[PDB]
Amino acid sequence: MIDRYKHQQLRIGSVSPQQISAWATKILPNGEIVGEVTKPYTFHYKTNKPEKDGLFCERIFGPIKSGICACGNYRVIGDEKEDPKFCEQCGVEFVDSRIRRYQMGYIKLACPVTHVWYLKRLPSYIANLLDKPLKELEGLVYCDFSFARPITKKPTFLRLRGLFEYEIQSWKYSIPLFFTTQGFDTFRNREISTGAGAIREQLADLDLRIIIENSLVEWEELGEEGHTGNEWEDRKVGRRKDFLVRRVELAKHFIRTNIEPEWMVLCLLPVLPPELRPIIQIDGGKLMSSDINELYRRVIYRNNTLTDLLTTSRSTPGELVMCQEKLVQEAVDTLLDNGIRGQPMRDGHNKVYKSFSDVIEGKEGRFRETLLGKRVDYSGRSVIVVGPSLSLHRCGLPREIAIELFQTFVIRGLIRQHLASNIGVAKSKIREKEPIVWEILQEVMQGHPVLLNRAPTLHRLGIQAFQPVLVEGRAICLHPLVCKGFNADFDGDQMAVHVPLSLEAQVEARLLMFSHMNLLSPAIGDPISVPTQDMLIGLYVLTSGNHRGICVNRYNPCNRKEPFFSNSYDAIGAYRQKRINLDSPLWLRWRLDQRVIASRETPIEVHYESLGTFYEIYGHYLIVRSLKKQILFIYIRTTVGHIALYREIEEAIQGFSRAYS
Amino acid sequence: FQETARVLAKAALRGRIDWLKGLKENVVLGGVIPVGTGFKG
Amino acid sequence: GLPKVEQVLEVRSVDSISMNLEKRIEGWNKCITRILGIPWGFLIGAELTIAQSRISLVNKIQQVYRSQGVQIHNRHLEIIVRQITSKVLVSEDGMS
Amino acid sequence: IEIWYATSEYLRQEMNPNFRMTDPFNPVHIMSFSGARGNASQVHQLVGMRGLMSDPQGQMIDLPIQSNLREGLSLTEYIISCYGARKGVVDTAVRTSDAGYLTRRLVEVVQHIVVRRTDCGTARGISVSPRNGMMPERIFIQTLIGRVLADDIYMGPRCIATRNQDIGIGLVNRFITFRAQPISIRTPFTCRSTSWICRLCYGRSPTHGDLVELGEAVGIIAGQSIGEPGTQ
Amino acid sequence: NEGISTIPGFNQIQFEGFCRFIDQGLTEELYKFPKIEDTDQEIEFQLFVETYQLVEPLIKERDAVYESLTYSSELYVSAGLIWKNSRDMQEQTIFIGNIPLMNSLGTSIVNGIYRIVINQILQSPGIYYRSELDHNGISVYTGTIISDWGGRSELEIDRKARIWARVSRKQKISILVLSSAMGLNLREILENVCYPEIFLSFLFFQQRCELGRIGRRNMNRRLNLDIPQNNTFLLPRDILAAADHLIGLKFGMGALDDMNHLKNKRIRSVADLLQDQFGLALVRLENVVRGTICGAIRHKLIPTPQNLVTSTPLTTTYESFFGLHPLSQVLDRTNPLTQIVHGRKLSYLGPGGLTGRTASFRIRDIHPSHYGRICPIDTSEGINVGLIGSLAIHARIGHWGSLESPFYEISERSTGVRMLYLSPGRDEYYMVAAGNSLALNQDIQEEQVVPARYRQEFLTIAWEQVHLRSIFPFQYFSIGASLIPFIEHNDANRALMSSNMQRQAVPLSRSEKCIVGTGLERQAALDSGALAIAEREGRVVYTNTDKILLAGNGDILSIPLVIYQRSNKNTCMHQKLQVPRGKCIKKGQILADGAATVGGELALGKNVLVAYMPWEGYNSEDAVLISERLVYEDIYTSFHIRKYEIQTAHLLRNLDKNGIVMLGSWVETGDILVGETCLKLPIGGRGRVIDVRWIQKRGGSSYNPETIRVYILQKREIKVGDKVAGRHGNKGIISKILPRQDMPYLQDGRSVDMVFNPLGVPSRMNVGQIFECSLGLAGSLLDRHYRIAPFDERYEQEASRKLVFSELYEASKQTANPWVFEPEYPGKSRIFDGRTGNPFEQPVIIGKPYILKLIHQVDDKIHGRSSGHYALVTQQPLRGRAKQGGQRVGEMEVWALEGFGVAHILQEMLTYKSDHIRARQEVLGTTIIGGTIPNPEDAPESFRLLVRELRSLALELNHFLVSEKNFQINRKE
DNA sequence: TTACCTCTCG
RNA sequence: CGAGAGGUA
Lengths: 661, 41, 96, 232, 973
Ligand SMILES: [Mg+2]
Ligand SMILES: [Zn+2]
Known about the structure:
Chain C: It is found in: Plastid, Chloroplast. Chain C: DNA-dependent RNA polymerase catalyzes the transcription of DNA into RNA using the four ribonucleoside triphosphates as substrates. Chain C: In plastids the minimal PEP RNA polymerase catalytic core is composed of four subunits: alpha, beta, beta', and beta''. When a (nuclear-encoded) sigma factor is associated with the core the holoenzyme is formed, which can initiate transcription. This is part of a larger assembly, with one copy of chain A, three copies of chain B and one copy of chain E. By secondary structure, chain A is of the alpha+beta class. Chain A contains 24 helices and 18 strands. In chain A, strand 15 (about 605-610) and strand 16 form a beta hairpin. Chain A starts with 6 loop residues before the first strand and ends with a helix. In chain A, helix 10 runs antiparallel to helix 11 (about 230-255), helix 17 (about 405-415) crosses helix 19 (about 435-445) and helix 22 crosses helix 24. In chain A, the strands form four sheets. In chain A, strands 8-10-9-12-7-11 form a six-stranded mixed sheet. In chain A, strands 13-14-18-17-16-15 form a six-stranded mixed sheet. A two-stranded antiparallel sheet of chain A has the order 2-3. Chain B has helices at about 5-15, 25-30; one strand at about 15-20. By secondary structure, chain B is mainly alpha-helical. Chain E starts with 11 loop residues before the first helix and ends with a strand. A nine-stranded mixed sheet of chain E has the order 34-49-43-44-36-45-35-48-47. In chain E, strands 15, 16, 17, 18, 19, 20 and 21 form a seven-stranded mixed sheet that branches. In chain E, strands 11-6-13-14 form a four-stranded mixed sheet. The interface between A and E is large, with 105 and 95 residues. Strand 6 (about 375) of chain A pairs antiparallel with strand 51 (about 885-890) of chain E. Bound molecules: magnesium ion and zinc ion. Magnesium ion binds near residues 491 and 492 of chain A. The structure holds a DNA/RNA duplex.
């Protein structure tokens, strides 16, 4: 066979600054760009209207009510024939409020910042690429230290070629005076380095193919006199040995992967769509406003302070800018992954704030909590009861539960039979509990199955399907023999019901999820539905037997049972008419072939007569034979109880056969 | 299923591509799982 | 009981499950190299380690279940055991 | 400790003979013998002696319990008995939790395995001998049922079984009568891939008693099967 | 003086704790208040603690609940401020704030809610020695110093003498250096310490150094020392002594401590917590006072002492404690038993206490020290099993935090006996016996032997060598276990279940007392608070359903009664009079009865005729078959009241002029109760509107939105699906109700009310029920009620059998019913079938036991949903019956569906039914029309959200499909 | 561990 | 809506 082929793929990748922009940018009829949100304002102060350039702004994130623009007029969406996509007065985007769920916005940052994950891991990805001490790259990042030779890409007149150096005491003013206005800037950019602009630039001009060459050589040289020294030393030799492999690998991937190494330090910053951070008025909820929003404002603020500081005060020293650079970085860090560095970063009243990593992680993290399982419609719950008379394929469903689950189906019926004019008309009939609603409900559920599950669903048998039968009362009735699979008892257990809507779904339930089809357990092949408690007691009693010797007769039978029956029906009859008891011994003629399970015992007495007939008495049977060696008669000693079990098993087989026909 | 941040980072860097050939993955995407009636033959 | 099954399945220490086993595996590896050549020695050594390991792990889990009267078929344990035992580690000396 | 354990144990041993010989139809016997409810240990406590108990930290308490529930436990005995009960309650709570972690993790390792092909094409199989381990015949039988043979088995010039044939209880028995020692079976360890299995290597299904169908989730069934017996 | 000679009141601990806080606690905290002056020198404030007065409550307690206020008391204290500039004195008494008051029962009413404070168990400050087995060779030993601060101090000795402090994360820190820090000479140390040679060979204060009084005493006992009690510090000599002991262990001369013993644990209570909070509040008043002083400077104004201090700090602290502390909980008022049990609870967890997931297995087992103090049976099952427990009947709290069990001294002395209370430590050193003196041989009584406890062990010794005897019947158990009859014959596992179920019983419309009981039902009623007892002696002069007047020596006292009122758990409270007019009463005697109480005893259930036999499968597993008599004679009917509240066609028939539904209306789901913003009835509530309350309110910035509350009553009868239980651990759910004619019947003609399965007793090990059913039958016939204390076999072997069999015989003879006692099979009889008239084959157990109806009813349980409201972010269905929500298909369920191979069914659950907005809206239409539903192609919202969230952390996820036929790659959105 | 229910509180 | 507490099976 030729396989039917389907190819699907999912790709994950870090994104460039230009992309984050395109995710959130539009050009209006005026020709004006929209998208960056600058102000920290959320809505309005007691006005309940989104502010402009605000975290909830309509123009950047889409309209709040459909068709009603910023101005307050309403143009009918569904028609683009003569509708300004963007109104002259305001950016309207008239079509839908759904966009507020999906639309994105971006924030420009004056200072380059660094992502936490690459830096945080002990085998830091940035460090692995850098080949410089982890402390040195980090120190520059969180504390004021300045690199001296930032770019190896371009030649520079000053030549200390130093690393991060704390002291800027080196003449810097005379150097600026000697140099032209910004002549110093060209030189400084080439040489002096600060913050993370330096990291971004060092990462940006790096030679990967060269990096591999150096590494391999160093890796080859290391291992000289390897495995031949004091315990302390070898350990160190190895740790370097690996850092080297790890680094070669990262670079190789970069060569063939289309992801640019500089993207790790971030120029633009992304913003979640406004709905996903409802921040609804905390009208007594008190937590309705999102911490997402709270964290967002801080980054927005420090950034605005810096943009102004630079514009306002070129004269003010780098000390003013240096002070607030660190502040901006820290807000972003908490927003991305707080607790990575272990900083509490919490308001005193508040718990440590929720970083976006927390949102994703764990049981309540998006993937486990929402992606793997979800709440559903067309479902119900109630307590369970014994239901002995039901058949294996059936279950009893309370009527109140049913009317809820099968409502749509009944409305159709009322309309189809023309007992109601409109959908609204019918819903009324359902409420007055008129008797007709019940005849229609019964008709609709006749060949439609339903699914039942118990709470701790340990194994497949936890969910099984049944044909529902309407019952009055408020509990679900279940067949006695299905309880082992569900592990259910009748002392407070509850169950849930689901209805299968599609035709495809309905076929699967009848054909692959019904009890008759699943009578053997998955683990070794054993029967899962077998008679278990009271039922077993009854079967044992029927087959238990009768007193045999001293128990039935006081004195030896030597010094000195009777009923003989021809067909089994007569015997069962005598039991009813009280002629005999369940345990009384009896003799039954058998016309068939010696199927009685009994021990291999030779006859107790053979009695042989002169004309030729021989009678053989065994413990449970008498066989009469003649000279021609033919068995004239066989009689079995038994009790009524034994014949009753045989008859039921036999009749059931024959009945099923006669029904098929 | 356990270390979500750590895995996701390593991957973004390497541009990993996942061909969706297992059960759990297709559940997240809300698409027919390739088992049983879903397996096509 | 259950703790033991978690221990066996999560193989924190190879010796922890069976002492006799660690012995064999460390021993085999040292000895095999001298006896056989590069193309064939790693391959044969792997096949032997894989075979003993597989028998022991199934047998250890199973003894715990049989003590308490729980009977589970082997095929099921084997699907799980294979994944535990299906991978190899390239060594320090190997760079290409 | 020793005198009391012997006394308790002899009494338990002798309970069933007393019921079967002197009162065959007693309600307590019917319920236990039938299999309906009750266990010998549970009955022993109602009708014999409860016995020596273990204190926390595993030390016997030295005061025997000479009473049963019908007769009535003394205050001192009742207090000693309580020890055991806290152990049970603590174990049940713990066991329910531990089982779930083991199951979640087992399903994850083997979720991807589905039966995707009819024959892998392997010509290798594991060999099962009655010897090579001291195997009670039971164990020998259970391993073999449901598996497909990887090579022909012959007694003299006649073939008992051919490659690609499933093994059932009747065949296994013939192998036992005729003492055919080395049997080679295709098994999950003999397949050629780790992302899927083939029908012949997996063998007969536990549910429907026939070769597994293409498209079945063998892995989810395995995780669940090892885990559910865990509650016990 | 109490508890010797009688069972102590069940609320005594709360009463004593509150009193201690009111006087001693208040004074101690007040003293520490600092005199406050600022800068180089400023005005000085004086809080004179000598004169503190607490004044009476302005509102009465009933009013406080009606208007949602808090019942409290006002603290007025005198103070003087000498403004630095003035040099003169002004004195006034400022109203510092409000401190809450307790009712005798032990509850506090705060913001309208009855609240109760639970007790906590924590490790006591002191020195503890542990021997840690060492991974290599010889074992390491260690010492530790628990403190009120909680800092622990570690000292350790290795195989080579180490004497190294382990407080530093670093391995080596010197204890000797700490001794030198104390100024001790090296020479001084040598003279002080024994084992000098070993130490020769070897040649903070704010938190750890304070040891409470409890901490000091423990130190002095463990290392014999006798620094006086007023001293409360980590004086250095102690550290030296500790080292000396540490080495003695290395040489064999020592004891390793057990930390689970109760001599090493302490109990905090209402008093401690309240005192603590007072301190926090007081520090907050200092902050406020300093601040107003600064304000005075700005305005340059002469302060009035009152102006400087506000009442906010005291009130706010308590309001927060009651509302948010872990150990302050709302009282369960389901039944009278629940109210009494809640107070007695003890928790290991709490603030500054253990957490359940974290805690060790060993902390959750019984220890031999618990006897007489903490009940062995009661615990809360779950991940919290073993950590929440209950105080025993005869326990009390000592001067130190420790608990105490009463013991009788049998040793010869003048009096020859006294009842004494012993600390958990003291009694390990005496031999205690619980046996009796009824054995005599040819020697004397003193030589006879008995089982006994000594040093945490059980042994057998002669009567001469015993010192103390345990004499009380209910001493080792809590209130719930002490309400079960014939407990000796029920396995202990069941007893946990049983105590739990009594707490879940519903007060019924008419109440009846039990035929068989244990005798503690009488005290349980007295202490619940549901009865009206006399406060003065007198004669009853007028009785009306609303009130009673008692006239004693020239005064007339009016006692209000409770008619049809709601409880926290939606149950009804109603009091009914027990006293005829014209009768004399003494103080403390009963005047009226509450719900679930008849004649001064607790009555939570009814007595019914029952048979134990199999019946057509209706009783399979644990299910019950019942007669209709119970339904039509109203044996098990209960009243339930719910409240619905708001803040400010056929429908609207009920509403009045203002629009609020009138009293006496019958309402059904959908009907508006109070007039867009309309409040409407949920599903399953249908009842008379018993009352409407337009409550004006204060406290909010606006006059608090007046609250309109509606209260609705539902009368509920027994139905299929209800849960019923007995007192011995037996629980079941009703499966069928059958007409009297079809029920099994006796030789008297009567038909049994309920039928239970008989296969249950062997598995669950409760033989108590068989003894109780049989005695019940006897009492009904002979007109007797029996109250029997536990453990009756102390008197003789097989005592219970002798009581039951004898009583059954008397009933059989006096009323001539021979079936009640049958000599061949005692306790069992032969009964007949209603359907056919034929005898059942084997004899069956018939009796009248006491059966209770539980709070879990079917009506509350049932739920259904189609369509409906959807959530904002996840866009999934809502959770909860109240919220009209869906049900969860979770991880485990998916796995099962996958095993079956039902892919289509699963996809549906993940898309159309939950979270695919476009798809969801279509299916409702296809179904009404009659069409086919297509398989969805786009992604659900759940997936879309993940992408957006990731794109927020700067990562991109894309889904592409590559066409097999032409090789094109298409990006799905 | 799963599911289920009620409440209070800023 | 975020926390806390009491239950159920
Ligand atoms: Mg149950
Ligand atoms: Zn007794």
